[PDB]
Design a protein around this ligand. Structure first.
Ligand SMILES: Nc1ncnc2c1ncn2[C@H]1C[C@H](O)[C@@H](COP(=O)(O)OP(=O)(O)OP(=O)(O)O)O1
Ligand SMILES: Nc1ncnc2c1ncn2[C@H]1C[C@H](O)[C@@H](COP(=O)(O)OP(=O)(O)OP(=O)(O)O)O1
Ligand SMILES: Nc1ncnc2c1ncn2[C@H]1C[C@H](O)[C@@H](COP(=O)(O)OP(=O)(O)OP(=O)(O)O)O1
Ligand SMILES: Nc1ncnc2c1ncn2[C@H]1C[C@H](O)[C@@H](COP(=O)(O)OP(=O)(O)OP(=O)(O)O)O1
Ligand SMILES: Nc1ncnc2c1ncn2[C@H]1C[C@H](O)[C@@H](COP(=O)(O)OP(=O)(O)OP(=O)(O)O)O1
Ligand SMILES: Nc1ncnc2c1ncn2[C@H]1C[C@H](O)[C@@H](COP(=O)(O)OP(=O)(O)OP(=O)(O)O)O1
Ligand SMILES: [Mg+2]
Ligand SMILES: [Mg+2]
Ligand SMILES: [Mg+2]
Ligand SMILES: [Mg+2]
Ligand SMILES: [Zn+2]
Ligand SMILES: [Zn+2]
Lengths: 715, 679
C-alpha cells in the first residue's frame, strides 16, 4: 500500500477517509449532507483513490493528492463543490507559506443530487438527457396556467420526463390471459401459446419488459395463479405421458405429480429472477406487481405456494430480500381467511413470508368489491380500476389502463388560507379547476397516440383488445374503460393548520378531512359525466412529492410548525407517522377515507417489530382489516448487515442507513429494505431524496417489540 | 539548468504523448507574470530558476509519463515555494478558469437549453416506439456534446467527411466501449450479480441459457457495439451434463433398471433443445434503449463429446425451424460455425453430420457463417469468433502466460474515407500518399482520444463488465478500468472503405486484372498495418486495421463526396462505396474467383476486421454448392458469409428477392419476411 508524505516530511499511512472528509467539508459549506450527496461524495472519493494508485506507486505528497481531488471534482462536473474546494485549499496554501476566483453560473452553483458521472449506469446517464429534453419541451406543450401551477408548486404534473413529450399512458393491468392464449408478436418473433408453465413465465417477463418501456407507470399480473394454472396442467399431462413409457405402473401418478411440483417452482423461480434482471431506459427495474390467492385447485394452489416460498428463500446465496415484483395476496372469507377454510395453509405461508420479506401485501376480496365495484389487484403501486363492463355485460378488469396523474398541494391551500376555512374552499375550487384542465389535457394527449407507438399494448393483447394500425387508441379508453387520477397529499397537515397537531380525536377536524375527499369525489363524478372517462380520487404515493411540495412551501411560507418544519408531508390520508396508535386504531381511523371517495388509489401501512417468531400477531391485524380496509401492507424490520450478521432495523442517519452494530453502510454488504410508498426500496443502493428519507426516519412502531432479530457479533 | 529525464513523455489532454519541452513550462510562467508587470532581466532569472525547480520536481516524482494537470500542479507548487504569490495567484486563477470552461463543454444543462432555444442544431441526420423516440433526443444531446469534446481537428474531419468518428450518439459523451467477447465461462462458473440478484452458478442448461440472455441484455446496455458468446457448445456442455446427472438419479427412483440409461439420455437431449430454444427466442425479445435488438453472435463447432455435439445440433435445429407459427427466419443472434479439418470438414470426420446440418441451415436461412479454424489462427494469432459484426481480437497471453480470448473488447472505430483521398489526388498517386499520410495522422489523434476517453470510465458505470466478470477479471470500485485494456489486451479499430473506388480512380473500372492496380490497393492495407503496429508499440494498445461494415457509413461518405466532387463516373454515380476490399458488387465473379482475389487483403494486414461475402445464384437452395465454397474457402479465407435467403411474402406465398412483392406488391412487414445482413 502507498504511503502519504505529509507537508512537513513525515510519512503516514494511507487513510482513505481523509479524502472523503475533506470533500465533505467543501460540500457542507454549500448545503447539508443528504443520502444522495453521500453516495456522490463516496463515488468521487473512489475515483481519487483510483487515480492515486494509477499515477503513483510507492509514495504520494499532500499537494499531489489535492491536485487529484480537484481534478476528479472537475471530471465529475461537480462545479459547485470544486469552486469551494479550490478556493479554500488555495487559501490555506498561501497562508502556510506567508477567495481566489469565481467561475460558476447560477445554475451550476447547486449540487445536482440525481446525477453522478462516476456512479451512474450508462443508460441511466443518457436517459437523464432524454428526460431533461422531455420535461423542458413538455412544459411548453402544457396549457400555460397548468405549467405555471406545476412550477410554482400549486399542483404536480406527474412524469414530465415522459409526458406530454410522448403520448404514453400510465399504468395498466396486463391481459396476460388473452396474450398467452393466442400468442403475440414481441420484438422480432411472434411466439405461439406456451405449452408449459416454464415457457409461460418466460413470456410473462418478456411481456413485462416490453410493457414497462411503452408506459411510464407500473404494471400488474392480476390473478396470476389462475391464468398460469392451465399451462401447469400441460406439464402434468406431459409427465404423465412420460410415466407411461418409463415409470412403473404403481408410480406413474406420483411421478407426474412430483415432477409438476418442481416444474411449478422452477417456473416461478425464473419469474422472480428474470424480473429482477429487467430494466427500463433509466436503468431501474420495472415496477411490477403479482396478484394471487383466489385459485382453488391443485395447480392454482401450487403456483401460490411456489411464489411465496421463492420469496421466502430470497435472492442469491446471501438470500437477500426481493424488492420486485410486489406480491399481493388475496384474502377471501370462506377461501383462506378462516382456519377451517381450504386454502388457510397458504394464508399461513403468506403470513410467514410477510414477517420475513414484508411482502405480500393483502387485499380484502369483499372490501375491494365494495370500495371499487369489482375485484382486481391495483395497477402498479396502488391505482385501482373501477368496476366496468363491456357492451355484452361482461365484467372486464385486466387489459385496462390509467391515463395520467395530477396531484393537488393541499397543505399549500391550508397555509394560504390563514386559518379561514372559507378561504380554503375558495382556493380549493380554483386549484380543482387547474387540475381538471391538466387532466383533460392528459386525456387529449394520450389519445393522440397510435397503435404503432406501442404494439405490445395496442396490437397484441396487453390492453385486452387488439387494434389495427388504422384504429384509434381511444377505442380502448372511452366509455369509462380507462381511469384518470386526481391526486392529493397531506390531509394531516391540512387539518393541523386549522385544528392543531392532535386533531385526530376531534370529530369536526376529521369531518373536514373527509369533506375534502368527498369534494374531490364529487368533481370526479361530474368530470366523468362530462368527458366519459373515469376520473377518480387517487392517494398519490409520496415518493418524490413529499419533498418537492414541502421544499417549495418552505420557501413560500417559511418553517411552519408541524407542517414544513419536519421536512416532509404525510401521505394522502395516512395517520401521522410520528404518532403511535395501535394497528387496530390506525385502520379504524383511516378506513373512512376510501369509503368517502378515495377509491381511485389507496393503501394502509402498519409498523411492526420483528414478527418472524410471532406471525399470529400479524394475523390478528389481517383478520381485523378484512372487514374495514381493502389494501393492507406490512412493515417489519428485515434489514441485514453481512459484516457482523446483524439483522433488524438499521439506524437512520443524515447520510442514509447504517448498521446499529458496526456502522456499515456499504450496500454491497448490507441489505436494507424500506417501504418507500407502496413499493419497497433499497435506500443504500438507490438513495431517496431528503424529504422522503425524513418521512421514513419519522416513522414510529405501532405495536411494541424489539427491532433486533440478530444482534450481531463483535468485530 | 537541469535536464529532464529522457524517459519522460508529456500526455496531452486529448491523450497524445508528446516530447517533453521545458520551454512550454517557462512560457506559461512568463504569460502569468506579464499580466502583472513587464518582463525584466531580473524577472527572467527568477522565472527560469522556477522552471528548473519544476523540471527537477518532475524528475523526482515521475518515471515514464506525466499528465498536463500534473505539470500544472508542480508549476503552481513551485511558484509558491519561490514565494511568487502574485504570479501564483494570477496563474492559479487563469488555470482554474480554463479547467472549468473545459469541463463545461461536457455539461448537458448548458447545451440542452441551447438545443431547445437558439443556436444548437436538432435536425442533423443529413421509429414509432416510445423508447426509440426518447432515445433520439439522448443521441441528439450526445452527438452535440460529443462534437465539442473531440479535439477540434478531429471534429472538423468528421463533419467534412474526411473521417468517420463512429457512434457519436454514445461516445465521447459516455466513456462506453464498443464490442466484446463476453467471458461467459467465468461468469457462469463463479456466479455474478446482475440487476438486483447475485445469482449462483447454473445447476442446469436451462438456467445456464437463461443467465446468458440476461447477461447479454445487461452487456448490450453497457456498450454501443455487439457481443459474442465464443465456443458456446463447449462451455454449456458441463451444464447439460448436470441435466444428465440428475435425470439418471431420477431414473434410479422411478424407472426400471433396463431403461434408466435411455431415460436420462432422451430427457437430457430434450433439455438441451429446450434451453437453446429459449436462448433463440429470448434474444429476439431483447432491446436496447433505442428499441432495437442488440447485435449478438454465437460461435460454436469445436466441441467433440456427446453434450457438445447435441448443443451444436440444437442451435442449428432451432434456427432451421424458424420463429413462430409462420417459421420466420431469425436474424439475431448471428450464428458462426467453426469448420476444422479433422473434426467436421471432410466427410469422414466425426462431426461431419453437424456440418451437413449447418449447410442445410445456412441454405434455408442465411446464418451460420463459417470460420476457417486454421486460417483465423494464421491471420489473428489465435482462434476466436469475431466480436459483434466482424471485429477480431489478436492472439494475446495475459500476465500469467495464459491465452485469453473471451473477456476482451474493442475500444472504438474511426474510418478513413479512402475514395475521397483518391478524388482529391487529381489523378496523381504522389498526392494520394501525401493526403493519405495526413488523414492517417488525424485518425491516429482520434483513436488515441477514444482510448483516453474509455479509460475515464469507472467500474460502477458498468458493473456487469468491470465488476462481475464480463471482461474477465473483476475490479473493485476504487480500481482503474485500464487494467483490462492495457498491454495490448483491448483492440482499437482503424477503419477504411472503398479500395475498389480508389483503384478505379487511378486504373479504371476493370482494374481487377491489372497487377499494379491490385498492388496499389494492397500497399494501402500494408501502410495501414505498419502504422497500426507502430501505434501499438507507442501507446501499448493493439491498433489494428478494420474492414468497416458498410451500414450507413457507405452512404454518408458517398453522399458527402457527391456534394464535394459531383457525379464521378464509377465512383459516386452508383450512390454507394464498395465495402473495404470487397470485389465490385456490380461484377459477377464465381465464388472461387472472388475468394482467390480477396484473400490477399487480410493477409496484407486487414486482420482487425474482415469478412468475405459470396452471393452466387447457383448457391440458392443448393447445399452441395455451398459445401464447395466452404471447402474452397477453408485454406484461403478466414470468415465467410453466404447468400441471403429468399424473401418471403406470407400473403400470396411468393419466394424471391422482391420493398414490394412481385406476385402481388405487399409492403406490410407483418406479412413479409425480408432477410438482410445487419452489417
Ligand atoms: N493519510 C492520508 N491518506 C490519504 N490522503 C490523505 C492522508 N492525509 C491527508 N490526506 C489528504 C486528503 C486531502 O486531499 C488532503 C488534505 O487533508 P487534511 O486531512 O486536511 O490533511 P493535512 O495533512 O493538512 O492534515 P491536518 O489539517 O490534520 O494537519 O490530504
Ligand atoms: N470550509 C471549507 N470550505 C471548502 N473546503 C474546505 C473547507 N474546510 C475544509 N475544506 C477542504 C479543503 C481542504 O484542503 C481540506 C482539508 O481541510 P483543512 O485541513 O482545513 O485544509 P488544508 O489541508 O488545505 O490546510 P491546513 O492543513 O493547513 O489547515 O478540506
Ligand atoms: N424461453 C422462451 N421465451 C419466449 N418464447 C419462447 C421460449 N421458449 C419457447 N418460446 C416460444 C416458441 C413457441 O413459438 C412457443 C411455445 O413454446 P413451448 O412451450 O416451448 O413449445 P414447443 O412448441 O417448443 O414445444 P415443447 O417445448 O412442449 O416440446 O413459445
Ligand atoms: N511538451 C510539454 N513539455 C512540458 N510541459 C508541457 C508540455 N506541453 C504542455 N506543458 C505544460 C506547461 C504548462 O504548465 C501546461 C500548459 O501549457 P500549454 O502550452 O498551454 O499546454 P497545452 O497542452 O494546453 O497546449 P495549448 O494551449 O498550446 O493547446 O502544460
Ligand atoms: N493571461 C494569463 N494570465 C495568467 N496565466 C496565464 C495567462 N495566459 C496563460 N497563463 C498560464 C496559465 C495557463 O495554464 C498556462 C498555459 O496557457 P493557456 O494555454 O492559455 O492555458 P491552459 O493550458 O490552462 O488552457 P487551454 O485549455 O486554453 O490550453 O499559462
Ligand atoms: N430463469 C432464471 N434466470 C436467471 N437466474 C435464474 C433463473 N433460474 C434460476 N436462477 C438463479 C437462481 C440461482 O442463484 C442460480 C442457479 O439456478 P438453478 O440452476 O435453477 O438452481 P437451484 O438452486 O434453483 O436448483 P434446481 O433448479 O436444480 O432445483 O440461478
Ligand atoms: Mg489540512
Ligand atoms: Mg432452479
Ligand atoms: Mg494550454
Ligand atoms: Mg419448447
Ligand atoms: Zn454490521
Ligand atoms: Zn406477395
Amino acid at each position: 500500500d502507498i504511503k502519504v508524505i505529509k507537508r512537513d516530511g513525515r510519512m503516514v499511512t494511507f487513510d482513505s477517509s481523509k479524502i472523503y472528509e475533506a470533500i465533505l467539508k467543501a460540500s457542507e459549506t454549500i448545503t447539508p449532507i443528504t443520502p444522495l450527496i453521500e453516495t456522490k461524495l463516496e463515488g468521487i472519493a473512489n475515483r481519487v483513490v483510483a487515480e492515486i494508485n494509477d499515477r503513483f506507486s510507492h509514495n504520494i505528497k499532500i499537494y499531489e493528492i489535492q491536485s487529484i481531488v480537484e481534478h476528479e471534482l472537475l471530471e465529475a462536473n461537480e462545479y459547485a463543490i470544486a469552486q469551494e474546494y479550490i478556493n479554500y485549499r488555495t487559501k490555506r496554501d498561501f497562508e502556510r507559506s506567508q477567495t481566489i476566483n469565481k467561475l460558476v453560473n447560477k445554475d451550476q452553483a447547486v449540487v445536482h443530487e440525481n446525477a453522478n458521472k462516476d456512479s451512474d449506469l450508462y443508460n441511466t446517464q443518457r436517459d437523464l438527457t432524454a428526460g431533461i429534453v422531455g420535461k423542458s419541451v413538455g412544459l411548453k406543450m402544457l396549457p400555460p396556467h397548468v405549467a405555471n401551477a406545476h412550477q410554482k408548486g400549486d399542483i404536480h404534473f406527474h412524469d414530465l420526463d415522459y409526458s406530454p413529450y410522448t403520448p404514453m399512458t400510465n399504468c395498466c393491468l396486463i391481459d396476460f390471459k388473452g396474450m398467452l392464449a393466442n400468442g403475440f408478436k414481441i420484438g422480432n418473433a411472434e411466439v405461439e401459446s406456451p405449452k408449459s408453465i416454464q415457457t409461460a413465465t418466460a413470456q410473462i417477463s418478456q411481456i413485462i419488459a416490453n410493457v414497462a418501456s411503452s408506459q411510464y407507470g407500473g404494471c400488474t399480473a392480476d390473478r396470476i395463479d389462475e391464468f398460469l394454472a392451465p399451462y401447469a396442467e400441460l406439464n402434468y399431462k406431459k409427465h404423465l405421458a412420460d410415466a407411461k413409457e418409463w415409470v412403473t405402473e404403481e408410480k406413474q401418478e406420483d411421478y407426474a405429480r412430483a415432477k409438476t411440483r418442481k416444474d411449478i417452482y422452477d417456473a416461478m423461480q425464473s419469474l422472480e429472477y428474470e424480473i429482477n434482471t429487467l430494466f427500463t431506459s433509466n436503468g431501474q427495474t420495472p415496477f411490477t406487481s403479482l396478484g394471487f390467492g383466489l385459485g382453488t385447485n391443485w395447480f392454482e394452489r401450487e403456483i401460490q405456494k411456489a411464489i411465496l416460498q421463492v420469496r421466502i428463500l430470497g435472492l442469491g446465496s446471501e438470500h437477500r430480500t426481493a424488492i420486485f415484483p410486489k406480491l399481493i395476496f388475496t384474502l377471501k372469507r370462506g377461501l383462506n381467511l378462516e382456519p377451517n377454510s381450504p386454502n388457510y395453509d397458504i394464508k399461513q405461508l403468506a403470513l410467514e413470508c410477510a414477517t420475513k420479506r414484508m411482502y405480500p401485501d393483502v387485499l380484502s376480496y369483499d372490501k375491494i368489491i365494495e370500495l371499487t365495484g369489482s375485484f382486481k389487484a391495483p395497477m402498479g403501486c396502488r391505482s385501482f380500476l373501477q368496476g366496468w363492463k363491456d357492451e355484452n355485460g361482461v365484467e372486464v378488469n385486466s387489459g385496462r389502463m390509467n391515463l395520467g396523474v395530477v396531484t393537488l398541494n393541499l397543505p399549500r391551500i391550508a397555509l394560504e388560507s390563514k386559518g379561514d376555512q372559507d378561504k380554503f374552499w375558495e382556493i380549493f375550487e380554483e386549484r380543482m379547476g387547474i387540475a381538471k384542465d391538466a387532466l383533460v389535457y392528459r386525456v387529449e394527449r394520450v389519445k393522440e397516440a397510435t397503435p404503432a407507438n406501442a404494439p405490445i399494448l395496442y396490437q397484441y393483447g396487453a390492453f385486452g383488445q387488439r387494434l389495427r394500425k388504422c384504429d384509434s387508441v381511444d377505442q380502448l379508453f372511452k366509455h369509462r374503460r380507462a381511469t384518470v387520477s386526481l391526486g392529493y397529499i397531506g390531509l394531516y397537515e391540512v387539518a393541523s393548520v386549522f385544528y392543531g397537531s392532535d386533531w385526530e380525536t376531534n370529530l369536526e377536524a376529521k369531518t373536514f378531512t373527509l369533506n375534502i375527499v368527498k369534494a374531490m369525489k364529487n368533481a370526479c363524478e361530474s368530470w366523468s359525466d362530462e368527458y366519459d372517462y373515469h376520473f377518480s380520487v387517487y392517494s398519490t404515493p409520496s415518493e418524490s412529492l413529499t419533498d418537492r411540495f414541502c421544499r417549495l412551501d418552505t420557501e413560500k411560507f417559511g418553517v411552519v410548525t408541524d407542517i414544513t418544519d419536519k421536512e416532509y408531508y404525510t401521505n394522502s390520508f395516512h395517520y401521522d407517522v410520528r404518532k403511535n396508535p395501535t394497528p387496530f386504531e390506525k385502520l379504524e381511523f383511516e378506513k373512512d377515507y376510501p369509503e368517502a371517495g378515495a377509491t381511485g388509489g389507496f393503501i394502509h401501512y402498519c409498523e411492526y417489530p420483528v414478527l418472524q417468531q410471532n406471525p399470529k400477531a400479524l394475523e390478528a391485524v389481517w383478520d381485523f382489516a378484512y372487514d374495514r380496509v381493502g389494501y393492507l401492507g406490512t412493515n417489519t424490520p428485515i434489514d441485514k448487515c453481512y459484516k457482523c450478521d446483524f439483522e433488524g432495523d438499521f439506524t437512520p442517519t443524515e447520510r442514509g442507513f447504517m448498521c446499529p452494530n458496526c456502522g456499515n453502510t456499504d450496500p454491497k454488504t448490507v441489505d436494507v429494505v424500506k417501504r418507500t410508498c407502496g413499493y419497497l426500496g433499497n435506500p443504500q443502493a438507490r438513495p431517496m431524496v431528503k424529504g422522503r428519507h425524513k418521512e421514513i426516519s419519522a416513522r414510529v412502531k405501532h405495536m411494541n417489540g424489539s427491532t433486533i432479530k440478530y444482534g450481531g457479533k463483535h468485530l
